[PDB]
Design a protein around this ligand. Structure first.
Ligand SMILES: O=C1CCN(Cc2cc(Cl)cs2)C(=O)N1Cc1ccc[nH]c1=O
Ligand SMILES: O=C1CCN(Cc2cc(Cl)cs2)C(=O)N1Cc1ccc[nH]c1=O
Lengths: 305, 305
């Protein structure tokens, strides 16, 4: 019993973090097989960051301009390339600790664990979500660039996120492991519009199911609703529209609690139109949307890796 | 910027988790050097759990009754003893992955990371606090017994918690690594009084400092107060009394934000007597007491391990 923001165990990722140094800049890299992946703005001085010509700047750099440290084992770089917004350093040594892994582009609303890192050394781990507007609300200080987000299925690490940027608004932006930014962002020191966010409806409902599994049942009502009627409520409260796909994803939680999906939408409706009255659900006084239905099932059933 | 419940990276602990099997029971153990530590109720059948005679039950067990699995490496048990509420299995093999480590008894209000585990395999990691009443509010399912809580300073793992028990109230109880329960609890299937909890005042204030560091400044008032006057407010709202020790611990955050401790107590006072008005502080609509001042300094300054 109980429900926490739980991250994946990070050991498999810890053995892949290295320090990457080019000119005056240092940030984190990810060392898998004989390749290190890091944000391409490692090649920039602070002057370059207003409008960098990455091609032109990369041309001035050779293999020996890149220092990769893995603890103390200084790796030797024997090849370099830019793929979108990441740099790929070919090193003479495959990582003895390389896990089975996949590069993935996650979808808005999916969650992952972040291993926040500084000078190639892990600092802490926490869970969060790709927002509908393709930002993440993280905890990242200067030097955390190249920290990665990930999921773990059994023994397989799916890397989905590399940190590039704090927006002047205090939220975070970054790329998949191919170097393509999530969202409209670019790797320049400029103000950049995130655009309107929404709340991840299917995740709130899954959290409502988690609450019922743990004995928090007070928001369970006697009303029901329809998908379209609820979607009327969702649009007004800046919630994502709920589709039959979402209803199917929630089927297993529906069945384990015996509360139909549309019935639990009827409770969410009341919570939206009437608030919480200063009560709490699973210890929070707000509706939480950073648990996917899988996150809930994994925690209330106990899946290991 | 940003502030999250952040756990320590768990890799050092992951390499120590093993499965421990005695009779019909299986739970997690912690393998350091040539000794495995696990809850002593591994030797109990479900009948025994109402009022077990642990001495008498342990007498019926020999070295070969204990199966320790570390992945697949079945370790061989060559010695066994009970220390308080833990069992210590002497195994023929020192753990190649033993980290530098200490056993510690933490104090109420201190925090630690839990690596929740099932059948000796890690499931997820999260942060929490030893409550004033010596329970923890965790996420633990059946089979999570023997999961451990810990802190990490540089390269040193301080183990502070081993999970034994979910109370019929849905909260969690357990021992230090010497086998002594935190709190009044015992390892029997009986209803057990946790006793009145309180809120950890010095932790709320540290979180208030974290909020000011991240730009959430709206609760900053123009009033001040005195330690005794504030303590009047604390006692009424079931907050722990604030002492000069706590004020000294907060000195570094006071200095970095330039807000005197007693001034920030004056804001906490207003928040307690008047609530939040449906606004939020660092994304929460409640006062958060599971960040120590060190937790805050480590996150808003970026300490690594
Ligand atoms: O480390 C750095 C260095 C430079 N820089 C600025 C730009 C990077 C990109 Cl690409 C375009 S502009 C940045 O954003 N970070 C991340 C970061 C900084 C402060 C608090 N939290 C953070 O995550
Ligand atoms: O795994 C077990 C097995 C038996 N058992 C009952 C007693 C143990 C002690 Cl000592 C005295 S009575 C227990 O409490 N757990 C932990 C647990 C169970 C269900 C949800 N969450 C949990 O943590």
């Amino acid at each position: 019993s109980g429900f926490r923001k739980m991250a994946f165990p990070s050991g498999k990722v810890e053995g892949c973090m290295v320090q990457v140094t080019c000119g005056t800049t240092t940030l984190n890299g990810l060392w898998l097989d004989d390749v290190v992946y890091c944000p391409r703005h490692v090649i920039c001085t602070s002057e370059d960051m207003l409008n960098p010509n990455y091609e032109d700047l990369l041309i001035r750099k050779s293999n020996h301009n890149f220092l990769v440290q893995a603890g103390n084992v200084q790796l030797r770089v024997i090849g370099h390339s830019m793929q979108n917004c990441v740099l790929k350093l070919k090193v003479d040594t495959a990582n003895p600790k390389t896990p089975k892994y996949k590069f993935v582009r996650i979808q808005p609303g999916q969650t992952f664990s972040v291993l926040a890192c500084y000078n190639g050394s892990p600092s802490g781990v926490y869970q969060c979500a790709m927002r509908p507007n393709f930002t993440i609300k993280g905890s990242f200080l200067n030097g955390s660039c190249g920290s990665v987000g990930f999921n773990i299925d059994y023994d397989c690490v799916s890397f989905c996120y590399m940190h590039h940027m704090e927006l002047p608004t205090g939220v975070h932006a970054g790329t998949d492991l191919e170097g393509n930014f999530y969202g409209p962002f670019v790797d320049r020191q400029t103000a950049q519009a995130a655009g309107t966010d929404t709340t991840i409806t299917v995740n709130v409902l899954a959290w409502l199911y988690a609450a019922v599994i743990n004995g928090d049942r007070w928001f369970l009502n006697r009303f029901t609703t329809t998908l379209n009627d609820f979607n009327l409520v969702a649009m007004k409260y800046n919630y994502e529209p709920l589709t039959q796909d979402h209803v199917d994803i929630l089927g297993p939680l529906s069945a384990q609690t015996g509360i139909a999906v549309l019935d639990m939408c009827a409770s969410l409706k009341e919570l939206l139109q009437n608030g919480m009255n200063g009560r709490t659900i699973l210890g929070s006084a707000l509706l939480e949307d950073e648990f996917t239905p899988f996150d809930v099932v994994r925690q209330c059933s106990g899946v290991t890796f």
